[PDB]
């Protein structure tokens, strides 16, 4: 109930850092998936021709 | 039985602090899991296309 | 039984996100399949002429 | 044998919370699988046409 | 050899409490595993369709 | 050798659930295969005419 | 060398319990595999017709 | 909120590497597909003559 | 150098007990692993059929 | 170098079990392939008549 | 309130050392992760080709 | 530098045991792979006939 | 702030070792992937002929 | 930076083993493909006669 | 500053023993990893054939 007020910022400071790197884990996947899916179509273009 | 009354607030003051940081451990996981699961689907979208 | 009420929204918030991206996995397939099938007919038009 | 009676509710309170979130893990899968399977058929419709 | 007779109940009282909570650790796992396994099958139903 | 008797029902309860959903994985395939094969004949009717 | 004789039954009692549940892990797989393989054939019946 | 600034470059350095190799996975497919499709036509030239 | 002779049996008595229970930790693993590996093959039989 | 002699039989006992089920994975395929190939000829008999 | 002033530098001297080695634990992970992720892509390049 | 000489055999005794069981992990794989590959060919014999 | 200067080399000595073995984990993958991909083409050469 | 020199041979010893078995994975495919392709021609000789 | 000179050898004698057993922890891993990796390739040889 006391002595934690200036310790609240302690975690909000860790959490706020989380949201920073969390954004990379989110776009990271999409950065990969961009090709992951696109590459799927490249192959679709391949098997459809038959 | 005596001399502890003003010591009861001592712990309720530690416990009440617990509930404060406990809320971070709870949302922390969800803060991470938010992507943890969402990222799962991103991959589902990936393997389903086959 | 307690301390989870504000954690229920935690998951409904992840699930509700699921339904959002889930809609893409559903239309994604159809987006592809649109040609997948249409392209089938294009070929039917091809082998039938004989 | 004593001092645990009011501690029994302690766990039934954790377990009862389990059943709450457990329901999400159960429907979660089905929420995903809904498309997981449906998407299977979409593809069946695709390979059968040949 | 003496002065412990009324101390025997001391431990049987702790042990007897153990058997009480021990039952929760046993059913707890099964409470979780219930879905743990069931959810396995849900996925089996998923990969088998191919 | 002891403390497992009431835990035997634990698994028979998971297994018995298995047999329940297992029946769906079995009929599921046949539900699909019904057309899978029938659709084969539809095509046989197609190539035989030549 | 002493004080363990009545502790030998302690483990044989845990091991003997193992053999009990171990039988479920063994039949469990086969319970699943029953369809796992059978379902394979169902599909064989499917691709062979071509 | 602090101590991560010089850690941001840490990931942008991994991501930037991703874009480097990602370009190979993209052209790789096309490098293969170049023949994958071209070879399709070679065969078209083959079955059309009938 | 003296007063330990009858204390040597003290430890050989603890060690000798070790070798007794140690045999269970050794066969325990194998008791489990028996299925651990056997169950592996059961699954091999499963994925090979494709 | 010691304490493993009676543990050697431990694995030879798992391996020897392997050879037992391994024989099923071998004949299993042939059990299926028996028709897999035979069914091929049935179809050969079909396309040759033209 | 007194006799600690020259002891404040005592800890700032330990903490300041922390920040020194802390920088290694941070870059250490990234030093490893550099390949950890890069190696992931190497494998992506591997499974995508199918 | 002293008191370890008779402790060197301690580990060479564990290591020497390693080489014993290590030989099983090596042949184990090959014992399985024997069919793993052979079974591959069985299937090759299957798809080639078309 | 003091007593760590000669401890800085301690870690740079571990890190510098990391970069040494890290190079193997990097080329290791490529050493494998060399065939991983090359073997892919070998098979492409196989399915394209149809 | 130290204590790894005699550990460098550790990996070159694993890698050098890789190149040994890697040669089998390379010729293995060709060993199979030898017939894989040759068998293709056998069939070409078959459909060309029409 | 005095009375420790003949105590310096005390630790160099413990440290020197460390370097002795430390060599086993280093080669131990490699002794295991030898198969750990080699066994990886054995499996690569397995999945590549498809």
Swiss-Prot record, chains A, B, C, D, E, F, G, H, I, J, K, L, M, N, O:
Q: Which residues cross the membrane?
A: 22-42
Provide the protein's localization: Virion; Host membrane
Q: Which residues form a coiled coil?
A: none
- Name where it mostly resides: virion
Topological domain (Periplasmic) residues are 1-21
This protein's encoding gene? VIII
Q: How does it sit in the membrane?
A: Single-pass type I membrane protein
Name-wise, this protein is Capsid protein G8P
UniProt subunit comment: Homomultimerizes. There are several thousands of this protein in the phage capsid.
UniProt KW keywords = Capsid protein, Helical capsid protein, Host membrane, Membrane, Signal, Transmembrane, Transmembrane helix, Virion
Parts of the chain on the Cytoplasmic side: 43-50
The scientific name of the source species is: Enterobacteria phage fd (Bacteriophage fd)
What does the UniProt record say this protein does? Self assembles to form a helical capsid wrapping up the viral genomic DNA. The capsid displays a filamentous structure with a length of 760-1950 nm and a width of 6-8 nm. The virion assembly and budding take place at the host inner membrane.
**Which is one Gene Ontology cellular component term of this protein?**
host cell membrane
